[PDB]
Amino acid sequence: SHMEQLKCCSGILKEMFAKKHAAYAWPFYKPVDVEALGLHDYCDIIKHPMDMSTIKSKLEAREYRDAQEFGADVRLMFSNCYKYNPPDHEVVAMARKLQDVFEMRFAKM
Numbered sequence: 001s002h003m004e005q006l007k008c009c010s011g012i013l014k015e016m017f018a019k020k021h022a023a024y025a026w027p028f029y030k031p032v033d034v035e036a037l038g039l040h041d042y043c044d045i046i047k048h049p050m051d052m053s054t055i056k057s058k059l060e061a062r063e064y065r066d067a068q069e070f071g072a073d074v075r076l077m078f079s080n081c082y083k084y085n086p087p088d089h090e091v092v093a094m095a096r097k098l099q100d101v102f103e104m105r106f107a108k109m
């Protein structure tokens with residue numbers, strides 16, 4: 001059921017926000033600050049920005065019909081990271097660690 005699936009989504013996102021994963025999830029907590037040194041071309045490369053606070057807000061405001069729509073937004077957050085940054089960047093290695101947390105939880109629900 002969609003209602004049940006969406007409560008599991010809330011649970012998944014709550015684990016991604018937990019202290020257990022903090023050392024590598026913290027650059028994904030809030031939207032990317034495009035007024036920070038570098039990132040002057042961030043809006044030129046990233047057409048659809050996404051972060052965990054935006055996904056949390058979209059869940060609370062019922063903007064997802066089902067788990068797949070929630071999943072698409074989490075994956076957009078990681079794909080934005082893989083598209084923008086060099087593959088050797090510290091943030092890419094952090095995104096891969098947080099995505100492993102996500103994929104394992106999302107797959108078992």
Ligand SMILES: CCS(=O)(=O)c1ccc(NCC2CC2)c(-c2cn(C)c(=O)c3[nH]ccc23)c1
Pocket residue numbers: 026027028029030031032033036080081084085090091094
């Ligand atoms: C919480 C939003 S923030 O603006 O405070 C912030 C702070 C630190 C960050 N990275 C720190 C770096 C790994 C050591 C990032 C960041 C996120 N993402 C998703 C990228 O793609 C990216 N590229 C370059 C920087 C970033 C964002």
